[PDB]
Symmetry: D2
Subunit: 246 residues, 4 copies
């Protein structure tokens, strides 16, 4: 219950990122709702956070852009006084068979999903190291652990994030900062995209829970890691996937 904490959530305007922002606010956090493109959705998330008694601002930044990231973190600290929690949820997919995959499809996914984590982690570190506390939680993917045929770029990025999480955990331990990852499986708000009722039905056979997850399942896990009580957990990846990857 995050009272007096401030959280910066990247890619917070919908789905998982939105559910995370809202849940953090519910536990008492002030929230920076980052978005890349659509201001309108981000503003809705801000409105909802204010409704439930917390404070929030919407900030536009490309997490693959060093200057954007620097200004975003700076705004957070300017408006809310500090940064206590970073959740790295920004990321795109550009699926294709390896043989079909364009160099720019590769670059855009790696830069957004992996380099964003690097850039954001780097930018918040100085503030967290100085204050001698912090939480970083990186949203990876179970596909980063097992691989996945359509997604060489995305798998590489998310596997990279899981590794980056461990280096960060190790480097920041001395200043009471924990760094952990959540690896979602197949969550409903990620699959507004995939509507073929056969590709869907097969995916579902892979899950012992026999159902797709919900955005709140990921928020539940993030909030647990963001909390003071989980202080002795660092460098870990928790799969939230209905048993798909064990």
């Amino acid at each position: 219950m995050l009272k007096g904490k401030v959280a910066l959530v990247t890619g917070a305007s919908r789905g998982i990122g939105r559910a995370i922002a809202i849940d953090l606010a519910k536990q008492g956090a002030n929230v920076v709702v980052n978005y890349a493109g659509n201001e309108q959705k981000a503003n809705e998330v801000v409105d909802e956070i204010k409704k439930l008694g917390s404070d929030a601002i919407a900030v536009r930044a490309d997490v693959a852009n060093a200057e954007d990231v620097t200004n975003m973190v700076k705004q957070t600290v300017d408006v809310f006084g500090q940064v206590d929690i970073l959740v790295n949820n920004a990321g795109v997919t550009k699926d294709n068979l390896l043989m079909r995959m364009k160099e720019e499809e590769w670059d855009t996914v790696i830069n957004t999903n992996l380099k964003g984590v690097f850039l954001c982690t780097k930018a918040v570190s100085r503030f967290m190291m100085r204050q001698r506390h912090g939480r970083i939680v990186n949203i990876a993917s179970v596909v980063g652990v097992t691989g996945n045929p359509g997604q060489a770029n995305y798998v590489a990025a998310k596997a990279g994030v899981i590794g980056l999480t461990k280096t960060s955990a190790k480097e920041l331990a001395s200043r009471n900062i924990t760094v952990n990852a959540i690896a979602p499986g197949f969550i409903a708000t990620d699959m507004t995209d995939v509507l073929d009722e056969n590709i869907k039905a097969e995916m579902l056979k892979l899950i012992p829970a026999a159902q797709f997850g919900e955005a709140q399942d990921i928020a539940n896990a993030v909030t647990f890691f963001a909390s003071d009580q989980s202080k002795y957990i660092t460098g870990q990846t928790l799969n939230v996937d209905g048993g798909m990857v064990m």
Copy 2:
């Protein structure tokens, strides 16, 4: 907030097991405090649980003994009406280098730490499958993941528990029962034998957190798994170890 839940915690009379029993009770559960030996410590845990507004009973059973286990689960259901949560924390250590390790040292550790999980999981399954809900959380050890020179028996047992957790998760998922494991690192309560300060200091070097954990760290993780909100997490092992094993 486990309201109306009933939990059976094996090896609950002290240290980690005790902290688990108390935290579950704190969240509203009625608790069965299992013990093997002297009943005084178990009775203290029961007294504490009643103090904080919940209900509890102390039940003696060797978890390696089929009839003891059967009777224990039966008592739980008889007294409290049902069983909602099982945490398998019973276990002994009998350390020795492999080539000196006695066969009985091996057997006792395997039977207590591994067979106990089997037996207790089997015993509660009927009840949980019928009611169509449940939580099982197994206390393993980070040493099960990495290996450890003094502890062939213990490492084998705990690695086995981690695998058993996955089979259970898979078998029980269709009935809304989740099964997960917590792998503790070096926790202060479980380090009473270790007063050799050169073993301690070199152990401590292995932990990025640069400190030993506390029993409550394990309780917080168990409670998270035992809760309704973690419903989409199954077959997973969470290391609570200050970053020791990543």
Copy 3:
């Protein structure tokens, strides 16, 4: 190339164990073909090894029995002068859903598959430690990594073996003994068990190679670990499974 080496292979009378025995002999090893009750078949394996220019003997031992194991190792050293390689392949399955699994089904699988590895590793260590070289390779199963619904006992046993492998690797490393595990997937001779095409075809979809393995696939990997050239590999588990577990 295994010239002048002597190998003890437990459960060597057929399938994977047989293929291992034969391949080791092919590379120049003298082989002890261990069996539990199938002497007919152990003698055939012995005959085949002698045909290809090597030497072998068949030795009955229950690997769960300390007296048998000690007898067996001693016979190896008595007949062939030394023991250079141990492959632990003995093991039974007794499948059942957790809720139905008998205590004796549990015990027999744990004792054969897990305690056998302990007992045999213990028995050979002193010889290997004294001569300051050795290879131990443990045959586990990919099911020990992922879990598997029908097989709580088998999964627990094989997960345990993978952990035991690491402790052994660590304890024996400075006497230039390496200890590694092979985790087979679905191998054809290993599924004389299954003839039912319902479960059989469901298994095949899980394998990217889109076909079951052969006993020789496991032998090829064992022989690689058994060789002098793999000296810098220890405590590892290699999945031989057509890509089923990545």
Copy 4:
């Protein structure tokens, strides 16, 4: 035993890459020795390969450069008729603490180590899928599995490679192409610039083998994966590290 095979080895002019090139040639492969910088060392490797009876050419390509890669693969097929084996060994390190690490230090390491694997895999797949056979082996690092304080960029890259390996294994299986990774530990030719006795001694304590590896240890493993006999192994990572990461 690689008779009639042709191998393309990236970063093959020295150390691990060179040992790999030479060992493949030893087993009968014709080899393309790729280099980035000055062509001299690459020419020496080529000379050595010819001495031992095989054929080779040295080819300049930035593995992060799409056109370079495309031309390199095309030259391979033009000169040697086909490509049967790809080993991705190209890669740089640019170490720094996260909060000191430059954006270009990040980029250069990610592009060379991770994007190079993508680009080369893509380029050869074309030819391997058609002929319906191939071997890709990616050289990762054990640091990609555990994390490592000085090396956020390198860890992210190598963790990414391990994931990319799995996607590739899965996509290429239907055309009888296997894709695996070797994760080296601390190998003597990788450590020239670790001059400090203090930093060396501590690294060594982490290795149960109590010694650094040699380039040939990696070549041993690569050759095993490149061979026909390892056909049922795909999507796997093998640590060659003296027991450092179990």
